[PDB]
Every structure is written in C-alpha cells, then in structure tokens.
C-alpha cells in the first residue's frame, strides 16, 4: 500500500460513519478516493487555516506527515487509476466552475489539470439557467449520458462550484450467469421483504464467517485491479460491524486468497449516492473554504472567493458481468461436500479496494436495493 492509504481508509470510515449516523434507512454509496482527491486538489489553491482544515478533514495529521508526501500520494494514486490499459470501468471527473471576471492564478489551473487531471471552467453565474446547464452538460459528457440534471438549484451569488462525479460498472473476474438470476426476497427489516433480482452461483469463493465482526465476508475480484469486499452482518450486528471495521482488518482479508465451496446469492443492483459536500464535509470539520473567511488566494490573488457549492455523485452497477464480450475461459473445481448457501438478502456493507495502493475506491451500504 501507498503512504496515504491509511489516511484514505480512516477518511472513508469517518465519512461513512457520519452518513450512517445521518440515516439508517437509506442506501449509502460514495467514493473516498474521489472526494479526497478533489479536496487535496482544492487545497493547493488555499493557505493556512483554510488549507490545514481540508487536509486534517481528510484525516491527515499535519504535525506528522509532510504536505509533499500527501500530494505525491494522491498523484501516484491518480497514476494507477488513470492507466491507458486499465481495463477497470471507472469514469471519474472533477469540475471546477468559477465566475468569469475573476483573474485566476495560472499555476493553480496548471496544477489542477497537469497533476490532478481536473477540469477548470469560467462561467457566468449571473444566469443560473446557463450556469446550471453548463455544469450538468459537462457531467453528461463526462459520464457519457449516465448522469443527467445533477445540479438542481444554483444560488444567485454562487462564485465557485466544485462538482465531483464517479460511475463504476465492474466486470467480475469470475462472473455470474444471467440465466441463474431470479427474483427473490431481500429482507429490508426483520418482518418486511422486497423483491430483487438475485444473482446465484455455486462455486469457489473467498468467503468466510468472521465471528469477531459477526459477519460473513466475501471478496470478489474485478477486471482491472480492484476487489469488492462485502460484509453481511449477523442479525442485530449491523451497527457492531460498522463500529468494528478497520483498515488493518480489510488488509488481512485481502492478504488471504483461500477459497471455499459456497452457493452464493448476490443481488443485481444499481445504486447512487448524491452528497452535498459542503454540508457533509462541514460535519468532518471542513468549514473555512466554504465561508467568507476562506483563503483561496492561490486560485484568485486579489478578489475575495469562497466555495459556494460542492457536490459528489457516485453511481454503481453490480451485475452478472459488466460486459458482454469475453475471451478468458476457466474452470473451478467444486468438491463433493454439500456447499453452504450464503445469501446477501438483507442489509450489508461493502468496499471496493484498488489492488496496487489498497485505496478504498468506494464504500457503501445496501439497505433496500429498490430504494432509489
């Protein structure tokens, strides 16, 4: 793992826990890497308390880790993510939208693009309709039509908007068969069910029951170099599971590549998290950059500037296999013994971890696959 990976994992937990505290009856899905990288990039146009709040709010202890190490960490992570031959189906973008008429520092726009692969734009925020359409149409192009009408309301006074999007439709190394998917109960609570398409495969899985977490733990690899890890808590143990997750625990799971016989039920779902990062990151202690006090002098030298709007949109599809064009053919040997049936048919927590850095690309919880 990279040197900033542990801070990223702690950030993931802090933001997840915040979101879990905010509601227990909604699906959660967000990108820790995506949000952190966007605010690491923003921090380059900041100074002092404004700057320090962002990095401390991303779980860096600035009396401990040098700022340069933080940035080459995000850099290195943005290098493995943006491989030419990635194979990982990961569309991600950062849109900086600043009012026209501000004289922008060249080096900030130079740092943004040719270090953090973000996009900077000068727009007339005088007309909300033009500015909103400019913002949504950029996200439309960037996701290739997968995210539309993202921004619902822009303020009249908005001078600076950050939009952060991510769509992920993964291809399983060891995929499910479409023919075996059938509609089944998902237990949204102890007495209520909902119908979901349930994917099913008898095979050899990295799957075990962890008594410490009171959870079943499933790891499945994606094409590209990322791993989905699913935690299915015993009854009454969801909150325990949320409380007890650590990065060292996830690391231990990824280090074991043992497989056992199992009949797995995993729902086919599409989930999205839409987050107001001003609200949400404000709760983690990032307030100055969003206020009149903000020192954004690395973005514009003479004029007062604050971050008016910051939005995260995360979209995920889980299916049998996110592409219908193959080549790699294999054979798992199932022993004669009767396999456990393990069904992810009630609320569960997940992470997608990029393999080279051990970064948490995504974290989420499914409470109701039909909750949209």
Binding site for Cl ion (CB under 5 A): 173-174, 220-221
Q: Which is nearer to Cl ion, 191 or 331 (CB)?
A: 331
For 265-278, give the DSSP string. Answer: EEE-EEEEEEEEHH
Q: How far apart are CA 296 and CA 304, in angstroms?
A: 8
- Alpha-carbon torsion, ordered 228, 250, 243, 92, to 10 deg: -40
- Cβ proximity to Cl ion: between 169 and 221 the closer is 221
- Closer residue to Cl ion in complex, CB, 139/219: 219
CB of 264 vs Cl ion, minimal distance in Å: 11
Q: How far is the CB of 222 from Cl ion (least distance, A)?
A: 8
Structure tokens given for 333: 């040997």
Q: How far is the CB of 221 from Cl ion (least distance, A)?
A: 4
Closest distance of CB 18 from Cl ion, Å: 31
Whole-number CA gyration radius for the chain: 21
Beta strands in the chain (DSSP E): 28-30, 90-99, 119-123, 160-169, 182-189, 192-210, 215-222, 226-233, 260-267, 269-276, 309-318, 341-343, 348-354, 359-366
Q: Quote the least distance from Cβ 220 to Cl ion, whole Å.
A: 5
User: Which residues touch 84 (CB under 8 Å, ≥6 apart)?
Assistant: none
Closer to Cl ion by Cβ: residue 146 or 174: 174
CA distance 58 to 235: 33
CB of 330 to Cl ion, least distance (A): 11
Nearer to Cl ion, 117 or 221 (CB): 221
User: Which single residue brings its beta carbon nearest to Cl ion?
Assistant: 221
- DSSP 8-state secondary structure symbol assigned to residue 179: G
Q: What's the rounded Cα separation, in Å, for the pair 239 and 233?
A: 9
Q: How far is the CB of 173 from Cl ion (least distance, A)?
A: 5
d(CA 206, CA 228): 11
Minimum CB distance to Cl ion smaller for 77 or for 223 = 223
Cβ-based nearer residue to Cl ion, 95 or 170: 170
């Amino acid at each position: 793992f990279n040197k900033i990976t542990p801070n990223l994992a702690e950030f993931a937990f802090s933001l997840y826990r915040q979101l879990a505290h905010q509601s227990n009856s909604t699906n959660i899905f967000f990108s820790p890497v995506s949000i952190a990288t966007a605010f690491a990039m923003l921090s380059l146009g900041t100074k002092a308390d404004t700057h320090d709040e962002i990095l401390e709010g991303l779980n860096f202890n600035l009396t401990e880790i040098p700022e340069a190490q933080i940035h080459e960490g995000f850099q290195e992570l943005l290098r493995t993510l943006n491989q030419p031959d990635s194979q990982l189906q990961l569309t991600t973008g950062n849109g900086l939208f600043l009012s026209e008429g501000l004289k922008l520092v060249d080096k900030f726009l130079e740092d943004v693009k040719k270090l953090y692969h973000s996009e900077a734009f000068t727009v007339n925020f005088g007309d909300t309709e033009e500015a909103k359409k400019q913002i949504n149409d950029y996200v439309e192009k960037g996701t290739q039509g997968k995210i539309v009408d993202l921004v619902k309301e822009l303020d009249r006074d908005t001078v600076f908007a950050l939009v952060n999007y991510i769509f992920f439709k993964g291809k399983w190394e060891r995929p499910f068969e479409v023919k075996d998917t059938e509609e089944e109960d998902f237990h949204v609570d102890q007495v209520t069910t909902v119908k979901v398409p349930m994917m099913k495969r008898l095979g050899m899985f990295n799957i075990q029951h962890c008594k410490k977490l009171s959870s079943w733990v499933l790891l499945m690899k994606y094409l590209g170099n990322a791993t989905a890890i699913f935690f299915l808590p015993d009854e009454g143990k969801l909150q325990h599971l949320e409380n007890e997750l650590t990065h060292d625990i996830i690391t231990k799971f990824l280090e074991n590549e043992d497989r056992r016989s199992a009949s797995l039920h995993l729902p086919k779902l599409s989930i999205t998290g839409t987050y107001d990062l001003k609200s949400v990151l404000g709760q983690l202690g990032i307030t100055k950059v969003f206020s009149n006090g903000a020192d954004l002098s690395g973005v514009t030298e003479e004029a007062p500037l604050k971050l008016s709007k910051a939005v995260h949109k995360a979209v995920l599809t889980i299916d049998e296999k996110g592409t219908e064009a193959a080549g790699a053919m294999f054979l798992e040997a199932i022993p004669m013994s009767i396999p456990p049936e393990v069904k992810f048919n009630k609320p569960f927590v997940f992470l997608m971890i990029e393999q080279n850095t051990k970064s948490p690309l995504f974290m989420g919880k499914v409470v109701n696959p039909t909750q949209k």
